[PDB]
Amino acid sequence: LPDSVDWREKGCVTEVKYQGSCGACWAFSAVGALEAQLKLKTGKLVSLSAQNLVDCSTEKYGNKGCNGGFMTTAFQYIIDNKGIDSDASYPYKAMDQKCQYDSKYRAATCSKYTELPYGREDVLKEAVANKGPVSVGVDARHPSFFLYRSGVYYEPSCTQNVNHGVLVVGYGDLNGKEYWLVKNSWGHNFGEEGYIRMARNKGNHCGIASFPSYPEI
Numbered sequence: 001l002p003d004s005v006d007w008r009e010k011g012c013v014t015e016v017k018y019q020g021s022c023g024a025c026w027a028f029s030a031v032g033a034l035e036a037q038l039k040l041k042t043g044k045l046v047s048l049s050a051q052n053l054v055d056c057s058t059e060k061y062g063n064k065g066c067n068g069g070f071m072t073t074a075f076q077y078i079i080d081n082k083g084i085d086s087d088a089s090y091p092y093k094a095m096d097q098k099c100q101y102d103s104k105y106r107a108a109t110c111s112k113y114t115e116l117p118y119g120r121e122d123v124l125k126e127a128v129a130n131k132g133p134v135s136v137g138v139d140a141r142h143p144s145f146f147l148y149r150s151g152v153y154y155e156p157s158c159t160q161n162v163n164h165g166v167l168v169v170g171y172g173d174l175n176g177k178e179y180w181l182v183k184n185s186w187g188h189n190f191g192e193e194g195y196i197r198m199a200r201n202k203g204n205h206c207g208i209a210s211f212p213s214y215p216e217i
């Protein structure tokens, strides 16, 4: 495997999104993973509708819209629904709404998804290198995560109990200190202009390898 990977260099990551006061992190994580697969399959980089997930991947999928949800059950909605709309046709409103999916605005499909084994950062590394960006949950319930500005993030009070959906778009090392490159959905001013580099091979730090998944078109 390569020592470092960055999927932004490969034209597979869209601009950073801003979830606002709506807990749609899981929707943004899910769409981000699919966006990479869509580029790999079709040649087009297109932001997909997180709002479509918030509004439509609801009770039947065990999701709670702006009060949280799962990337895995989001992918299964896209599979069952036979499509997801573009962000352009179904833009983000940071609120729970009635489902407004229309197949006339379909931008991607999903055929399957894969959930990686619990806590295996080596299996995660392999998937990031060979398959694409991987949706993950992290423990983001610490002020240090909010206040993060730069470098490799390490929080000694972090747990493996995950509560925030993000996307691993790469990995590497900062002067030997190994990290995962994570795309957040907290706007362009969070962390390193939307991104956080999180400690890698530090005992599943903040639960980053607790619940990884990726979709396929």
Ligand SMILES: CN1CCN(CCCOc2ccc(-c3cccc(C#N)n3)cc2C(F)(F)F)CC1
Pocket (backbone or CB within 6 Å): 018, 019, 020, 021, 146, 147, 148, 149, 185, 186, 187, 189, 190, 191
């Ligand atoms: C330590 N620095 C203070 C000034 N900061 C200036 C840039 C702004 O920093 C932030 C950006 C987003 C968030 C944030 C937190 C939860 C949800 C969402 C959503 N959606 N955005 C928080 C901060 C914040 F907590 F840090 F303010 C950077 C961090």
